[PDB]
Write a protein that binds this ligand. Structure first.
Ligand SMILES: *C(=O)[C@H]([C@@H](C)O)[C@H]1CC(SCCNC=N)=C(C(=O)O)N1
Length: 435
């Protein structure tokens, strides 16, 4: 450890701003790692610690940041030959500081006090991760201390915190998607040949086949005041029974297949950070299928996966591979690597994506309007999700402008559902993006 602290570790950057850098000190270990906006960027930087090693981008891009990367070998030779103090390379992220800060701020004020959860912003046409927010977060300056006791105390406080602030909730945790998963049930039906004008039950209640279990609308009220409702109408008003009926009519295999087409049960590519796998679940019976259709049973998504669903629809049906690192530099600022955007797969036809967009623009209009942006059209799906064996989660997925999208977001507020919170958070992130 002594020698690797005698060489100046390189910088983690966002928008030409520093997220992590190293300062020359009088310490036995010469360089101290500094995080100037610590809690906000901790999901992106991770920590770099004498006692506890590294996480996130400190760990992923460790060869570049410490200067040991093969691609940096010439610079290291030239410096030693010339007498120059050596320095590691730089990692330039895809994070937009304005959007990251707006996601964080909105999370710290959006639950009459701080929310627990995650915000992800994506650029639909490129796959760039524009923001990666987790709350509560922690201060990596605490683990950068050269004092063993300060590090050990911080490590212990963090690990005993029931809110688990070390966890990057945007990419490492999976949550039931609830109402947001109607986007997938809808996509599956549209692809199988159903249309927006198709008629579905408006009944307040629906039996689940092969069980005494029963599903209901919110909170026992009929979708319309008519016998049935159109698919568009049930989508925009987020009726449950209609979708239980739609999904079972569509069948398990079509639902599974659309779920995989949208990245579920599909091993995620590193960003370079590892992303937990999302799942539609086994769907072992028809009771399960009705429950899967409205985002429950065994469906579990990372906030990132849910932002990608929105980004895929925004991008005309094509999924761009999400990435966090735009380019790697050497100590001179010479380009070592530039990331090139990659089309992962087509999930749905331009037609189905267009249809889903219309429905989502309708769902946004029906929704609570706090934080709406004048002259900007937003396509969205709000929702709640039940979990465990408890207050439901609050979700918002969206993209904007709906006509030619520049940004897609997912907002998850753990336990945030009322009986509103997620959507204004989403819209502040969008607004910051479109500035
Ligand atoms: C979706 O999962 C839920 C639940 C019944 O399963 C329903 C209830 C709500 S919450 C209302 C939030 N309004 C908006 N901004 C919705 C919905 O998102 O409309 N779906």
């Amino acid at each position: 450890l002594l020698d690797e602290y005698s060489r100046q570790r390189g910088q983690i950057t966002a928008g030409g701003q520093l997220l992590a850098y190293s300062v020359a000190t009088d310490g036995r270990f010469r360089f101290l790692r500094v995080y100037p906006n610590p809690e906000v960027y901790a999901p992106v930087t991770g920590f770099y610690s004498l006692r506890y090693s590294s996480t996130a981008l400190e760990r992923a891009e460790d060869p570049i940041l410490n200067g040991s990367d093969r691609r940096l070998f010439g610079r290291r030779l030239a410096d030693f030959f010339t007498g120059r103090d050596p320095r590691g390379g730089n990692v330039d992220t895809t994070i937009n500081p304005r959007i990251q800060q707006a996601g964080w701020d909105a999370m710290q004020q959006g639950c009459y006090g701080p929310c627990k959860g995650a915000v992800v912003a994506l650029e639909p046409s490129t796959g760039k991760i524009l923001a990666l927010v987790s709350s509560p977060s922690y201060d990596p300056n605490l683990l950068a201390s050269h004092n063993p006791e300060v590090q050990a105390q911080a490590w212990q406080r963090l690990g005993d915190n029931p809110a688990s602030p070390l966890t990057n909730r945007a990419i490492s945790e999976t949550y039931p998607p609830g109402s947001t998963f109607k986007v997938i049930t809808t996509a599956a039906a549209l692809a199988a040949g159903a249309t927006e004008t198709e008629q579905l039950t408006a009944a307040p209640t629906i039996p689940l086949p092969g069980s005494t279990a029963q599903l209901e609308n919110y909170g026992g009220a009929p979708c319309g005041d008519e016998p049935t409702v159109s698919l568009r109408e049930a989508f925009v008003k987020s009726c449950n029974t209609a979708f239980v009926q739609l999904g079972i009519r569509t069948g398990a295999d079509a639902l599974r297949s659309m779920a995989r087409a949208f990245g579920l049960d599909s091993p995620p590519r590193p960003t370079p950070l590892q992303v937990a796998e999302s799942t539609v679940g086994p769907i072992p019976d028809s009771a399960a299928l009705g429950m899967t259709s409205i985002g429950q049973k065994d469906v579990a998504l990372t906030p990132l996966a849910n932002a990608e669903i929105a980004a895929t629809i925004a991008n005309g049906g094509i999924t761009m591979r999400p990435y966090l690192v735009g380019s790697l530099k050497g100590p001179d600022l010479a380009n070592i690597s530039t990331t090139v955007r990659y089309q992962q797969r087509r999930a749905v036809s331009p037609q189905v994506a267009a249809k889903l967009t219309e429905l989502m623009v309708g769902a946004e209009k029906v929704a609570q309007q706090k934080g709406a942006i004048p002259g900007v059209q937003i396509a969205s799906k709000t929702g709640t999700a039940e979990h465990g064996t408890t207050p439901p989660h609050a979700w918002y997925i969206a993209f904007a402008p709906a006509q030619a999208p520049k940004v897609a977001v997912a907002v998850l507020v753990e336990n945030g559902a009322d009986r509103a919170l997620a959507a204004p958070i989403g819209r502040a992130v969008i607004e910051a993006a479109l500035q």
